[model samples]
Target: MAGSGIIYKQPIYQGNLIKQNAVEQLQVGQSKQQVSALLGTPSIPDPFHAQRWDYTSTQRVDRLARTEIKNFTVFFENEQVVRWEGDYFPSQDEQLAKAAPKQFGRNLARDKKKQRGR
Candidate 1:
């Protein structure tokens, strides 16, 4: 059926909204089952890459759309996580820097002073 000279409201969708907090919960050395339990099954799990998992999310609206993707790798040296890498993985340093805006200025000034001393 075609619209009868009327526009209907569309819904905004961002499938399986993944929270930063949930991503933060992931840690090194976690088992595959543990990671699955925490973050859910991979959005794109390929048989070719048994050790790697990819998680993806996208938001779409009439105005704009954006995407975020994360990847995790598991090692088998002893059946452990070893490490994981992906876009936007949060770090303590990043969190600290975000919280310490004034500290950043202080550090910049201190570095300039040290350079002049040399």
Candidate 2:
């Protein structure tokens, strides 16, 4: 049955206007409230990761412009901002610096496998 009302579909964004600057502006240890204020609420909030939030968009501006899609993840520990991570904007020095040591381990798929096997 289809209900008549406003709904934000999941993993089904249809736009090409990504607020690239918004993601880039995110800094490590930033509060979740701050992020929400800047980017609004996420479309998806996975149950596995309570602290995680995601955003997506696909509004097209030009005929030849590629689809715009992006997401952000905010992690917390002890109810405090631990760090922030995302793939929309690559080479974010500030975010990268926060995950320096652990980033290598989390990003290194090979290392994770080795540890799991051990």
Top of the candidates by lDDT = 2
lDDT of each: 0.36, 0.38
Clashes of 1: 0
Q: Model 2, residue 52: what's the lDDT?
A: 42
User: Highest TM-score: which candidate?
Assistant: 2
**Any runs in candidate 2 off by more than 4 Å, and if so which?**
1-30, 42-50, 54-68, 89-118
TM-score of each: 0.31, 0.32
Under the 3 Å rule for N, CA and C atoms, how many clashes does model 2 have? 6
Per-residue CA lDDT of candidate 1, range 7-83, in tens? 55332321222323334344446455566555434332344534534344332323443433333433322333444
* Model 1 regions lying over 4 Å from their true place: 1-22, 25-28, 42-50, 54-78, 88-118
Kindly give the number of clashing pairs for every candidate.
Answer: 0, 6
After TM-score superposition, the amount by which residue 88's alpha carbon in candidate 2 deviates from its true location, in angstroms, is 1.7
Displacement of the residue 77 alpha carbon in candidate 1, Å = 4.5
